[model samples]
Target: AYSITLRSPDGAEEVVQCEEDQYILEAAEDAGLDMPSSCRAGACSACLGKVLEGSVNNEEQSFLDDDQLEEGWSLLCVAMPQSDCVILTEQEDNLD
Candidate 1:
């Protein structure tokens, strides 16, 4: 199992384990973190975030532009962290 640390916009954080092929968003939801998101199929850009620490695989690439990818911005709905991480949630757009 992989571990993930999701940080809140105000700096609050939580750790959760993920299944081998689990999407970051699913892991977050299972952990009871209400990460503001819609359209789990990666169609909406609501679940975007920056990878403060660790790498993540972009399983689907349609939503993000080249510029956003360079800045570590990823749609959590279809993303899977390759390693343990410390995510910056304040930078996340949809926490409401």
Candidate 2:
């Protein structure tokens, strides 16, 4: 299992788990979290995160631009943890 530390917009924190075959958002819900997600297929910007620590397997994602990806942005909807990591979530609210 891959350990994921989720930090919400309100500063709430949660620890979730994801397997190699599961997405991080799916694991968050499995842990009883009501995450902010619109498209689970990585075709939207609603489910966003910044990986502050460790890395993620987000190769399936294509929504984020190079600048965003360069800034550590990863779509939680399609991101899978490659290692234990801390990800800031619900970041779309920060855009406005």
Candidate 3:
């Protein structure tokens, strides 16, 4: 399991335990945290966030291009924590 620190827009944060194979969005919801998401698939940008620290393994995230991936932008719906990570949430604006 990995410990994920999710930071909100207001600087509030919630820490939750996530299994390495589990999707981060679902894990956050299961932990009773209000995470923004729409399509659970990797096609939507709704659950986007920036990884401030550590790493995550992503599936075929067709919505995000290579530049966005290099910028630390991740789609929580398709992201699995490869290590303990700190993610700043509410990154839908970043897509624009």
lDDT of all predictions, in order shown?
0.77, 0.85, 0.90
> 1-96 in candidate 3: lDDT tens per residue?
999999998998999899988999999999898888888799989999999999998765779888888889999998999999999999998775
How far residue 29's Cα lies from its native spot in candidate 1, in Å, is 0.6
TM-score per candidate: 0.85, 0.90, 0.94
lDDT of 2 at 3: 82
Clashing residue pairs, backbone N/CA/C < 3 A, model 1: 9-90
Best TM-score among the predictions, by candidate number: 3
In model 2, the runs with Cα more than 4 Å from the true position are none
Candidate 2 residue-wise lDDT at 47: 86
Rank by TM-score, highest first: 3, 2, 1
What digit string (tens of lDDT, one per residue) describes model 1 on residues 8-76? 777788998886578988899888887867787777677877788888888674777777777788788
Candidate 1 TM-score to native: 0.85
Query: Candidate 3 local accuracy as lDDT?
Result: 0.90
Task: Give the better candidate number (2 or 3) by TM-score.
Answer: 3
Please list all clashing residue pairs in model 2, or write none if there are none.
none
Please state the error at residue 5 of candidate 2 in Å.
0.6
